[PDB]
Design a protein around this ligand. Structure first.
Ligand SMILES: O=C([O-])CC(=O)C(=O)O
Ligand SMILES: [Cl-]
Ligand SMILES: [Mn+2]
Ligand SMILES: [Zn+2]
Length: 452
């Protein structure tokens, strides 16, 4: 009746031994957690990274949020003190109760009531921003003299600043600018402030740490049910699925998990409390809302497990004409070019993705040759700004190769869309390529030698 809470997601309590290596741990729990999309991780009792900041010197500009189910939202001044004051007063006035006396079950039930009720027009605010000088990480960073306890946590794998640049991580090696994706984001929550249903760019993992405050309530869907969920959403809110002009225009929405459950989409929930992690797995849809004033920090990451999904994601973006954050192939080749310093399991996994890449590229080049494209010239795609190497048709970021024509200077298509460049005959076209097939096989060989 009204709201039936989804079943709880898995909760893990690793020993210090298990916890010592986050990537080994994530790999370990993967068979369980990828069935539920999200999971919660409680660190050992004494793993307690110190949080310290001046609530008066940290400033941010809040986003305003209307709370209407199925309404389109875009994904995209307070001090921490004055936001907290606003947040606490809002919640206490809303329920006419002290804040720690409002039950989490009640806040959840009320959230789904208010987003579905037309006559209510509750609006709330929240902070979402990457770490900057005006507002930095909640974890200790090297810089100001740190206490020994802060020094304990400087190099932790679970310190979310480190997570991207570890050796079992793959986003580490990207030299391209992907700041929105490799740097942690900070989130200052208040009662009912929410994150709409979404998956991460390039189907990456994410990991979210609640530094302090009241809980964050999550709903998650396993990766295998992603298209099921999108089909439900497409039927109920087709506006969200119209083509978008860029990455800064992704449309997202609030939707009751019971609606998904009614359509046989599996959904799991959890209340993430202060000091706990939530991990989301590749292509795992998630959404949720904050129970009260709180402070979270999150970052994307990519393991070796993710590599073939990353390749699939970019193919999916092509089919949808969605812009890429980076070139997957460019990342693969960057890693190949550094094969000698790669971790060995990483090298082994990159090698396998590269073999697919090369075999696909071979077939694509054979096809465009048969279309009458004869002329060719090497081109260092990685030097071009992204907006100068997107396929005219499908918007993919080109790297392995593209087609150009003197008739349309500066315009490019990927090898899937040779017909979409211009009206000139194909003998006027050039194949622009980063590597010959003969360049590529030795690069893959280096990875093989490293992997042994
Ligand atoms: O998607 C996540 O990691 C959760 C999120 O944005 C938030 O805490 O507002
Ligand atoms: Cl409403
Ligand atoms: Mn997310
Ligand atoms: Zn294309």
């Amino acid at each position: 009746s009204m709201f039936l809470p989804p079943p709880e997601c898995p909760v893990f309590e690793p020993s210090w031994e298990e916890f010592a290596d986050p990537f080994a741990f994530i790999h370990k729990i993967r068979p369980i957690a990828e069935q539920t999309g999200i999971c919660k991780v409680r660190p050992p009792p004494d793993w307690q990274p110190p949080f310290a900041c001046d609530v008066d010197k940290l400033h941010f500009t809040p986003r305003i949020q209307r709370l209407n189910e199925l309404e389109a939202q875009t994904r995209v001044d307070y001090t921490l003190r004055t936001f907290g004051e606003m947040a606490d007063a809002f919640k206490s006035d809303y329920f006419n109760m002290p804040v720690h006396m409002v039950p989490t079950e009640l806040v959840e039930k009320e959230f789904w009531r208010l987003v579905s009720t037309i006559e209510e027009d509750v609006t709330v605010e929240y902070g979402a921003d990457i770490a900057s000088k005006e507002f930095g990480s909640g974890f200790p960073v090297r810089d100001i003299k740190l206490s020994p306890e802060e020094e304990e946590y400087l190099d932790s794998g679970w310190n979310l600043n480190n997570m991207p640049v570890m050796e079992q991580s793959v986003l580490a090696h990207i030299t391209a600018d992907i700041c929105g994706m490799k740097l942690p984001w900070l989130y200052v929550g208040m009662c009912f402030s929410s994150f709409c249903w979404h998956i991460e760019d390039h189907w990456s993992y994410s990991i979210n740490y609640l530094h302090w405050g009241e809980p964050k309530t999550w709903y998650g869907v396993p990766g295998y049910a992603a298209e099921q969920l999108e089909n439900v959403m497409k039927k109920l809110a087709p506006e969200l699925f119209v083509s978008q002009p860029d990455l800064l225009h992704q449309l997202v929405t609030i939707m009751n998990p019971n609606t998904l459950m009614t359509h046989e989409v599996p959904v799991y929930r959890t209340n993430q409390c202060a000091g706990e992690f939530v991990i989301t797995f590749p292509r795992a849809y998630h959404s949720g809302f904050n129970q009260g004033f709180n402070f979270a920090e999150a970052v994307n990451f990519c393991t070796v497990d993710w590599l073939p999904l990353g390749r699939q994601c970019v193919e999916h973006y092509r089919l949808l004409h969605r812009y890429c954050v980076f070139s997957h192939d460019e990342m693969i080749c960057k890693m190949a070019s550094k094969a000698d310093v790669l971790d060995v399991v990483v090298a082994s996994t990159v090698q396998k993705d590269m073999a697919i890449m090369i075999e696909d590229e071979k077939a694509l080049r054979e096809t465009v040759r048969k279309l009458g494209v004869i002329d060719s010239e090497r081109m260092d795609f990685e030097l071009l700004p992204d907006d100068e190497r997107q396929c005219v048709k499908c918007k993919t970021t080109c790297f392995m190769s593209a087609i150009s024509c003197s008739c349309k200077p500066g315009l490019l298509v990927c090898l899937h869309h040779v017909k979409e460049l211009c009206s000139c005959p194909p003998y006027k076209y050039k194949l622009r390529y980063r590597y010959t097939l003969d360049d590529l096989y030795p690069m893959m060989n280096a990875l093989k030698l490293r992997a042994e």
